Ligand binder design. Sequence first.
Ligand SMILES: *[C@@H]1O[C@H](CO)[C@@H](O)[C@H](O)[C@H]1NC(C)=O
Ligand SMILES: *[C@@H]1O[C@H](CO)[C@@H](O)[C@H](O)[C@H]1NC(C)=O
Ligand SMILES: *[C@@H]1O[C@H](CO)[C@@H](O)[C@H](O)[C@H]1NC(C)=O
Ligand SMILES: *[C@@H]1O[C@H](CO)[C@@H](O)[C@H](O)[C@H]1NC(C)=O
Ligand SMILES: *[C@@H]1O[C@H](CO)[C@@H](O)[C@H](O)[C@H]1NC(C)=O
Ligand SMILES: *[C@@H]1O[C@H](CO)[C@@H](O)[C@H](O)[C@H]1NC(C)=O
Ligand SMILES: *[C@@H]1O[C@H](CO)[C@@H](O)[C@H](O)[C@H]1NC(C)=O
Ligand SMILES: *[C@@H]1O[C@H](CO)[C@@H](O)[C@H](O)[C@H]1NC(C)=O
Ligand SMILES: *[C@@H]1O[C@H](CO)[C@@H](O)[C@H](O)[C@H]1NC(C)=O
Ligand SMILES: *[C@@H]1O[C@H](CO)[C@@H](O)[C@H](O)[C@H]1NC(C)=O
Ligand SMILES: *[C@@H]1O[C@H](CO)[C@@H](O)[C@H](O)[C@H]1NC(C)=O
Ligand SMILES: *[C@@H]1O[C@H](CO)[C@@H](O)[C@H](O)[C@H]1NC(C)=O
Lengths: 118, 406, 98, 98, 49
Amino acid sequence: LPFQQFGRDIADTTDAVRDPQTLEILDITPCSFGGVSVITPGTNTSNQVAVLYQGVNCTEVSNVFQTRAGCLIGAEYVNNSYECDIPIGAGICASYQTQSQSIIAYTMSLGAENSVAY
Amino acid sequence: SNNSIAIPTNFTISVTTEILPVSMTKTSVDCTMYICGDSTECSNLLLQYGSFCTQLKRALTGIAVEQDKNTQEVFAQVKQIYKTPPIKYFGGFNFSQILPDPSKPSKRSPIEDLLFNKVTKFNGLTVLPPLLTDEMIAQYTSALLAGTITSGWTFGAGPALQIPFPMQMAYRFNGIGVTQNVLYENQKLIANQFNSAIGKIQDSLSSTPSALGKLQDVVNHNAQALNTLVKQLSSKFGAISSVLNDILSRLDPPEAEVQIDRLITGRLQSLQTYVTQQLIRAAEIRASANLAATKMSECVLGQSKRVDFCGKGYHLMSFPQSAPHGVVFLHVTYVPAQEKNFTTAPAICHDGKAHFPREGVFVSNGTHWFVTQRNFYEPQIITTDNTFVSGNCDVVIGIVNNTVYD
Amino acid sequence: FNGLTVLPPLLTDEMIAQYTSALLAGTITSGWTFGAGPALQIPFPMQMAYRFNGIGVTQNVLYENQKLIANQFNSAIGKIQDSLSSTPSALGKLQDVV
Amino acid sequence: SNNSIAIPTNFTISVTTEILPVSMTKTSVDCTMYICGDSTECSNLLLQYGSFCTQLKRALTGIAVEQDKNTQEVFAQVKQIYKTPPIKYFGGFNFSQI
Amino acid sequence: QSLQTYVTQQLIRAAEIRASANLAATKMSECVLGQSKRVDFCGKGYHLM
Ligand SMILES: *[C@@H]1O[C@H](CO)[C@@H](O)[C@H](O)[C@H]1NC(C)=O
Ligand SMILES: *[C@@H]1O[C@H](CO)[C@@H](O)[C@H](O)[C@H]1NC(C)=O
Ligand SMILES: *[C@@H]1O[C@H](CO)[C@@H](O)[C@H](O)[C@H]1NC(C)=O
Ligand SMILES: *[C@@H]1O[C@H](CO)[C@@H](O)[C@H](O)[C@H]1NC(C)=O
Ligand SMILES: *[C@@H]1O[C@H](CO)[C@@H](O)[C@H](O)[C@H]1NC(C)=O
Ligand SMILES: *[C@@H]1O[C@H](CO)[C@@H](O)[C@H](O)[C@H]1NC(C)=O
Ligand SMILES: *[C@@H]1O[C@H](CO)[C@@H](O)[C@H](O)[C@H]1NC(C)=O
Ligand SMILES: *[C@@H]1O[C@H](CO)[C@@H](O)[C@H](O)[C@H]1NC(C)=O
Ligand SMILES: *[C@@H]1O[C@H](CO)[C@@H](O)[C@H](O)[C@H]1NC(C)=O
Ligand SMILES: *[C@@H]1O[C@H](CO)[C@@H](O)[C@H](O)[C@H]1NC(C)=O
Ligand SMILES: *[C@@H]1O[C@H](CO)[C@@H](O)[C@H](O)[C@H]1NC(C)=O
Ligand SMILES: *[C@@H]1O[C@H](CO)[C@@H](O)[C@H](O)[C@H]1NC(C)=O
């Protein structure tokens, strides 16, 4: 409305501002913030680590991969599926695999296929 | 009366629904971002304050791993993924409503689709996705259903041993105390009753939204807690302003220290209250998830003799279904019906000897005495095949006279 | 009386007593049938015989010894009241809650 | 020993007692009344303090509904109120104490 | 602070009472409404009633 300048959301935080010199409405969005998770095997095994930036689009932050948990750097996605070693996020687990001894990310396998002859 | 018994002459196959929460939303907080934002001097003062941030982070991480473990305990009972045969014939039993639907990309059963349709910020608060996706939980449910349909209870106690479904339900009847001849005679009626009950389950779930009220209650409580925290972030707690940028752009350091102390104390108290409430709710969710795991082991992976544990009535089967942040159990039970009055006697006196039924009760139609099984009326001629003597006539109270054919 | 109030429970003592009486009557007159469907009438000696058969003892054992088992049950039930009355620590959990 | 067994030749019918808490007292607190009651400016500054009153009231209401649900779950197993027959004979078993 | 401590303690005790009431409901279903094969669940000895 032509008389108010600030906008607020259900959280009582400043979401929109009317520019003083030129009269337009600007939406304010907090620039990308997130958590960092370090994915590592035992230090005795190796010192290689992967980094998961949680809930961050992998642009804002075998090298990079976009998980629904976040952006994972230092892990190579493999289309093979294994049993989960250490959880990462929504169905993706990481492991220290030789196959090329490095950290790999993969969709976890729920179990061996079995079709009973009914 | 001390002479009359009531014996059922028919039965109903009933399917009941039990909804149990399993997991809740995994939330993580950053103490520094919540309390102080990006104010470096606030961060230094908080560092001087104490070491509550690490304790709160430990508690929340424990809750998250707790939720993942709850889902794993409930749904990862099996070690192999079982697939139902392409020809879906199980002696007239229709599991289409229960089995996954290939047409939908999600590969979820129609009941699971109904459940998912019914039950459906940046101040340092983050929501971590669960380790197991909805598709993975659906695949666990499909494997459990396929194993139960194709192998009975065998896959839970070892290798999956194939068995025709009518024979499996006959052995379940034998478990609940009814001879298998009853099922082999009334297979079509039992299949029709099961199909009608399964069809009615979906309409029952759709009609009453209170059935899925527990899962929505969990979601609502988590949302209310997060909203309360965010709102408490806008309180003053005695300070002149509720914004750290305002308190830093209006005041010199030494006199802004007291106001920033007030803000820090208030926000620490709010966040600690949130963590304590989350711990208590996590305890409740563990209780529910342990109950769900016990039911999956005892109702789905086998036949349970515990009364009212798996539905109401004599338990036959149980089928799992994944629901958002929980599980739904379709308990298939045997409910006797069409009861009839009869005259009963503890023993039959013949040739000076007392006779007792090996299994069943003695039933008179007024004129003749037969022996029946307890839960169903199948009269049979009293013979030495289904009686044992073990006693004398005079000692037993209430004995009656009749002939026991050889 | 400075802001603290006690809300009465939804079910009164009479209603809990009626529930208990209904459960007792169902157990005595129908066995376990009323918990799994319609209440099926059955004489109490036959119910005890089938409960004996449940724990692995044949029903002839009950029928031969009906009077002895009835006397033992009556004596035990009569002794329960005296055991409750004599020892106040028996109800210690409810009193602990209060 | 690898040749000997012990077989019972008699039995005892024993009645034991188990006491279980089910519900506790439902209490409600008025945050304003407890903290200051009629002191108006105290109420105003408590309002300035935060929204703890609403959370406390919600927790206590949840506890009360919890207690009612506990009693209902324990005692409302039967859907029909069964009545014992006028003649209280059950093969010599004396239920007058129960 | 006093009232918050009271409510937290009440919540913990309420959790304990839910545990007790769930146990009581299970025993009503399994000991009263049927005969239980579980050892020591429904009294000491072979459960009859
Ligand atoms: C000065 O104020 C007027 C107000 O209408 C605005 O239109 C103008 O853009 C402002 N000056 C500049 C250089 O932005
Ligand atoms: C966020 O991440 C997704 C990943 O698929 C990407 O498509 C999208 O453009 C990103 N948004 C940005 C860059 O803000
Ligand atoms: C592995 O999966 C990704 C995602 O579906 C796909 O882009 C990639 O081509 C796959 N690699 C194969 C099939 O070797
Ligand atoms: C059955 O109960 C009636 C009660 O009127 C009694 O008269 C009769 O003797 C009883 N029959 C027995 C105990 O065999
Ligand atoms: C049992 O019930 C079904 C449906 O209620 C009915 O079709 C059938 O005839 C009944 N059987 C007997 C023996 O009454
Ligand atoms: C019963 O099965 C048939 C095919 O087996 C299917 O067409 C039908 O839809 C099923 N019934 C229901 C209620 O879905
Ligand atoms: C058995 O007889 C009694 C007495 O007439 C009656 O009240 C009851 O309804 C009858 N039950 C059945 C199943 O016929
Ligand atoms: C009882 O059953 C026998 C055998 O079927 C029959 O001959 C007799 O007429 C029946 N009596 C009554 C009253 O139904
Ligand atoms: C039937 O058995 C009873 C035993 O209680 C006996 O007293 C009676 O004489 C018998 N009836 C005969 C032999 O006709
Ligand atoms: C019992 O075991 C002992 C072992 O020394 C053996 O000598 C004895 O023959 C066994 N008795 C029977 C009855 O097997
Ligand atoms: C069992 O004990 C009772 C109680 O003393 C007694 O009356 C009865 O005779 C005993 N039975 C045997 C077979 O000894
Ligand atoms: C036992 O039964 C008798 C006869 O019915 C009765 O008088 C007595 O009150 C009952 N109970 C006790 C405690 O003896």
